[PDB]
Amino acid sequence: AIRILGCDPELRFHHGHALNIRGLFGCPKTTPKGIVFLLERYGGATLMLYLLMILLSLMLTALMLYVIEDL
């Protein structure tokens, strides 16, 4: 498919000027062979583990936001 935006549009701009990210040949494939296999066999468990890590990170950061005010 034609990529009208950049291959990494979040990094396309710095301040008000452009950056050197473009689809000169195309967008790289970022799905390793092991991961795509894992995303269908035992795939449903990885989503729960991914969400739990986010929840644990949220709980830890909130505690640091509490400690760093008292410190």
């Binding site: 009208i4 935006l5 000027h17």
Partner: protein, 552 residues
């Protein structure tokens, strides 16, 4: 409110239009590579992709140069006009607003707005043209589903529209809190010898920290607002894509793939566009004060257009009463009625706080009387041209300010054309300042520090007297000037007041709460409680009441 911002940029639309045609041409060359090249098997792909890459690089280089050059003109124009509008305000405006508060608005608030405008405008145009190109491809895939996407699109505007008002009031409080801290800093730094003398260094630092704490409280809410905004735009964009996929799945039209492959790209452009609106609202709040200055109408009357070739120094007050706008219900002056004539010296005497310096302020047209009228040569002061009026009327303040430049520039300050050194030397000789200025290592080229801190206590009045004399003024005001002068300077002052042949071109108002020089005055006016209680010559006042209660 938004139209007030972009109204200034509309003065240079031609430059931006040239920028717009370059970016769209550069975009077309960049999208040409995926459309035309196969990167397989071959030379045909390599040469055209090399040429188009150079063309894209060159076109965007020229476009960025025009954009940066145009933004520089807008910034310098906006910052210049904000400062020009500040100086047009009334004298009360600079008592309501401190000098550190005003300078923060002119220097930092204006630069924040243009900096914000610079980054967002280029990003907005870039995503607008690609969004249109992505939309056009989607129209080819499916007319019906694009209309459904466009119909439900305005619903996504609702939530950023709510956050936008949060950004406005949040930014306004941040800007004014920084102004408060700036005033605290510059007020202490401008009076370090007093702060050091009273050991209040840590008292000033603590007073400064109380302002940073207010900023810290607002900065905490700004960080939460960013995360809320970043969550809503990304989540809402996902639902728009998923909702269409559900409709697409319910419609299985086997060619829906070509519409989906670019619909997933259109939502990424909308996601970026929805993030622009909160920062646009931030810029609106970041510039409330500077736009308030630019459209506020000053309290002063407009300057008139009268420039007589020759003017007499006939100044007459007629039932003048005045009250400062800070306390408009308390009258500082009551029913003043006296006349100044050329060739005569009038002495104004009174206790501290009697209103003498207020009389001088009215004569210099710094304030308007609340009653009666004040006339110069038969015409009201506002009827004269601004620069013309301040050449005929000159004054020496109770504590004259001295600007941080050379002595010759201080003496010749405010004159339309630079006088020759022969004129400056004559003025310095006439005021007695030549006795000490010539002794400086660099003479008239010596740079003086802020507020004239380098000069001695009594020498500052001598330099200020020279500044007033060089105008060849018609009315001369001496507010407490003669107290600290040397014996040599005092002889010069009483020579120019009572002896010099140039007296007949001047009318002099002499203000002093001491009897040092009022004996030779042609008329003496005693001011107490804002009203003139006694008047007459020196001998007449002696016979009026025994020992006068002010000299024995």
């Amino acid at each position: 409110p938004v139209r007030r911002l972009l109204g200034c940029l509309g003065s240079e639309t031609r430059r931006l239009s040239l920028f717009l045609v370059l970016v769209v041409l550069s975009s077309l060359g960049e999208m040409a590579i995926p459309f035309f090249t196969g990167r397989l098997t071959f030379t045909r792909n390599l040469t055209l992709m090399s040429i188009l890459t150079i063309a894209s690089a060159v076109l965007e280089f020229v476009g960025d140069g025009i954009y940066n050059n145009t933004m520089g003109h807008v910034h310098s124009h906006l910052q210049g006009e904000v400062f020009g509008a500040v100086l047009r305000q009334e004298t009360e405006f600079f008592q309501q607003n401190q000098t550190g508060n005003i300078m923060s608005r002119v220097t930092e608030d204006t630069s924040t707005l243009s900096d914000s405008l610079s980054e967002n405008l280029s990003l907005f145009l870039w995503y607008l043209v690609r969004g249109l190109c992505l939309l056009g491809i989607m129209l080819w895939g499916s007319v019906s589903l694009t209309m459904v996407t466009l119909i439900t699109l305005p619903l996504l505007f609702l939530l950023p529209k709510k956050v936008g008002k949060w950004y406005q009031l949040l930014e306004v409080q941040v800007r004014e809190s920084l102004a408060k801290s700036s005033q605290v800093a510059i007020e202490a730094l401008s009076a370090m010898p007093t702060v050091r003398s009273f050991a209040n260094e840590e008292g000033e630092a603590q007073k400064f920290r109380e302002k940073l704490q207010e900023i810290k409280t607002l900065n905490q809410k700004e960080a939460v607002a960013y995360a809320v905004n970043s969550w809503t735009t990304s989540i809402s964009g996902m639902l728009l894509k998923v909702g269409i996929l559900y409709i697409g799945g319910q419609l299985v039209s086997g060619n829906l793939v070509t519409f989906v492959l670019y619909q997933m790209q259109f939502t990424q452009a909308v996601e970026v566009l929805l993030s622009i609106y909160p920062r646009v609202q931030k810029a609106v709040g970041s510039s409330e004060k500077i736009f308030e200055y630019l459209d506020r109408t000053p309290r002063c009357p407009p300057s008139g257009l009268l420039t007589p070739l020759h003017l007499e120094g006939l100044v007459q007050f007629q039932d003048v009463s005045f009250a400062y706008p800070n306390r408009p219900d308390v009258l500082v002056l009551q029913g003043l009625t006296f006349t100044l004539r050329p060739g005569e010296v009038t002495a104004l005497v009174g206790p501290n706080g009697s209103g003498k310096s207020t009389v001088a302020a009215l004569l210099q047209n710094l304030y308007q009387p609340t009653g009666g009228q004040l006339l110069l040569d038969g015409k009201p002061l506002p009827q004269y041209e601004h620069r013309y009026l301040h050449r005929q009327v000159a004054a020496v303040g109770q504590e004259p300010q001295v600007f941080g430049r050379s002595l010759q520039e201080n003496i010749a300050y405010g004159l339309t054309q630079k006088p020759t050194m022969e004129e400056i030397t004559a003025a310095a000789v006439k005021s007695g300042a030549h006795s000490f200025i010539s002794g400086l290592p660099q003479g008239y080229d010596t740079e003086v520090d802020e507020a004239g801190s380098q000069l001695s206590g009594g020498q500052r009045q001598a330099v200020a007297l020279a500044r007033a004399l060089i105008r060849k003024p018609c009315v001369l005001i001496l507010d407490d000037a003669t107290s600290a002068l040397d014996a040599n300077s005092q002889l010069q002052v009483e020579q120019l007041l009572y002896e010099s042949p140039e007296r007949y071109s001047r009318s002099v108002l002499l203000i002093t709460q001491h009897l040092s020089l009022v004996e030779q005055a042609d008329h003496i006016l005693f001011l107490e409680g804002g009203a003139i209680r006694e008047g007459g010559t020196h001998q007449q006042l002696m016979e009026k009441k025994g020992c006068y209660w002010a000299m024995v």
